Design a protein that fits this description.
The structure is cut from a larger assembly and holds chains A, B and C. Chain A is α/β, with parallel strands linked by helices. In chain A, about 20% of the residues lie in helices and about 15% in strands. In chain A, strands 1-3-5 form a three-stranded parallel sheet. Chain A has a three-stranded parallel sheet with strand order 2-4-6. The longest helix of chain A has 9 residues. Chain B has a domain of about 60 residues. Chain B contains four helices and no strands. The longest helix of chain B has 18 residues. Chain C is extended and about 90 Å long. Chain C contains nine helices and three strands. Chain C has a two-stranded antiparallel sheet. The chains are: A alpha/beta, B mainly alpha, C mainly alpha. Strand 2 of chain A pairs antiparallel with strand 3 of chain C, so a sheet runs across the interface. Chain C binds three RNA strands through helix 1, helix 2, helix 4, helix 8 and helix 9.
Amino acid sequence: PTHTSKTRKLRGHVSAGHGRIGKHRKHPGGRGKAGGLQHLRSHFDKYHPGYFGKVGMRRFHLMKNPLWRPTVNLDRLWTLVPNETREKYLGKNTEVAPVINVLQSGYGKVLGKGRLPDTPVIIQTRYVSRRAEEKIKQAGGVVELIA
Amino acid sequence: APGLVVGLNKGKTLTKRQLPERPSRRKGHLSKRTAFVRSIVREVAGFAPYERRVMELIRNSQDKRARKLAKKRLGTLKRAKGKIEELTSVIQSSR
Amino acid sequence: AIHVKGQLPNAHFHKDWQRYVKTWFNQPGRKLRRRQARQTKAAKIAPRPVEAIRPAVKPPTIRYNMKVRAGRGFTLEELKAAGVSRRVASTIGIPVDHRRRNRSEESLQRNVERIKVYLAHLIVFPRKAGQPKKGDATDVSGAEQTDVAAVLPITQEAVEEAKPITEEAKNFNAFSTLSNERAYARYAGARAAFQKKRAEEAEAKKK
RNA sequence: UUGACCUCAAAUCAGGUAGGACUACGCGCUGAACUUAAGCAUAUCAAUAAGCGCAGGAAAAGAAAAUAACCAUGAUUCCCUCAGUAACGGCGAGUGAAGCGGGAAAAGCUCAAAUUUGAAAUCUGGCAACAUUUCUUUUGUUGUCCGAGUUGUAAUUUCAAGAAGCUGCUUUGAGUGUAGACGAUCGGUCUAAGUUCCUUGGAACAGGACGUCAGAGAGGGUGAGAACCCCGUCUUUGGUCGAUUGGAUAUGCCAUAUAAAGCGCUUUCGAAGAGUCGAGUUGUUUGGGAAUGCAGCUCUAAAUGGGUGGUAAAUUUCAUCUAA
RNA sequence: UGAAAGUGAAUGCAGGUGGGAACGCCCUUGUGGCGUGCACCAUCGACCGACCCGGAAUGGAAGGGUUUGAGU
RNA sequence: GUGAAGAGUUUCU
């Protein structure tokens, strides 16, 4: 609040912490971030490299909905099923395998990271990486593609 | 219909059904009464000067000149080709 | 000038922004006014439901096509399948959407099922009191205002918990199929051009 | 000569209408500069200030010539998010939307394009009569006559359709009086209680003692800090006007009520907005980038045609919509 | 990660080396040895994306690299 | 806009 501010302690000091020589005049190097190529170049080149220039193609009217594809890794596939489903199937030997719908969980692609249990499991996803599919096959499960 | 998110026929496979006919999409068809009215109007009013010039070019067998003139007068080449086809049909009917 | 750590400033306050500052001090008042307005409407239209029955539709785009939400109104084909005229649907509180069309039997059956449930649970007061006409009811004594959402909630599709792993699934190659299908779609036009050349440029070997 | 029609005049002709003011919000036109870019011209300030025209209680927008590319959505407006993102920018300073999704609220429709052609079935005005009133102030009906109108007023149709049939279909608008609830009610309230004693004080509304009310200890006044002195505060039924076919069986019932919609087999069909769309160029504007919108000039269309699908051009497909 | 089309992180105890907190076991008083070893730093590798390769219609699976990333 | 000439199916005077 105001009572704990530095201004209350600066009362009585003439320069208010801004010095007697340089003072606290209005904008002495310009306004905003102007001058980044001429007199702010030393700051720009050492703290914000790559600021000036053009790189890449333009895409007119980009819509992110067709590009929506969140990813999940293998070491979280068994976290998407309820606890009762995990107790029923994980580590057991059943005639049927649990089905994990990654799309319903809110992911577009299944990526291969971490390990999987040896219990078979069915993974439904729009996309899957090659390593993820190989590890799922090693674990005994299968990947069926959905839309 | 692969049923996947990639491919020529991608997408979830459902039970397709016949969509009902939309009367709005019937627009653009030529009616018998409208064609009769347009024929009468073409009988009463003559041809535009550019239409006559394109007709002369067609009768002189200068197809490229007729296409260029119709394109310049009517804007797009699609409209130019349609006008040339119509004028060619009228010339054939006249002959 | 800029000499401190952090990202470069990007404040969009070079106009007279203080003239058009919008405050929300009337937010509780607006909430109370809207609550009183809908309470007034409920008392005015009683015993009719406060909200009309809405169809269940699939949102567009791949980001939301896995969900189910409420639509604007039932289509003409859905009303015809449910045996409700479009001129009577508005009277009995069934919205009509002429723009939407049923491209799938699944959506058609889902919506006509919603209409049938609505019709079964609907009580229609006779226009002439004590003279029940065709389609009306004579048990209007117990009628009261009830929410349509409770009767017909918008239900998301259920997932399959488990199923046997088939040998066709075990032999299926998901990643290879995705790559091959993407390549097939990408180079479909090039193959079509090659087929056209293979036909036209080889027909020259006839004469 | 007269009459008819057309066009154009005049009347202090009969009846009307407009101006002006208010501008917080609203719809447009016109339109800067200071300033920032550490200078400065593009840019920015800003599609702002000033100027001008025009409304209401809201205005505007609005039921796709709309998105999307999906398992598809579905009038308009507003909020959150998209997003300080795509994009624009001496790519410098800076600027900067839209689809989807969630919510508030939801309401749909009307004409022109058709031969009623066995009947202009349409409308205004004068006169007269009969009703009506927030109201002797308001608003209609009927009769007759004269005008408008065939260079087109009525009816079924508006593309979601629909018409002509063929063809089985089924059946309804308007006065009064009682019990709860509704704008305002008010003859305005049963709406509760100390002004007892002692001290100080000019004055007790201060302190102390003895009490009281409280669904009322919010506030104000009274000669100083008053729940009980006063106005008030809290709770609380009933008189009256009006709506009282506002609603209930709105009774008792006036008399609506015999000609009018609906699904369905079937075909013939199915009229759909022009100096408009579109193209070029110029200016301006936009995030819109080989033109986002607007405007001037030139050219100037078509009927499965035309618009849109955010990179200019040609060709072939597809999706969506149906402008002027 | 790349401009993008796209691809997309375990050889191992989720690796080795050095210092290293705390703890445990001994020697005897030491600025003592032994065993693991949190955090952090330095370093040698492994994996993912990009690039440069060979590269045995479409695909780039294995083998690589003096490299490159705001990665595991 | 309307009518006559001229120039090596047309528009220049």
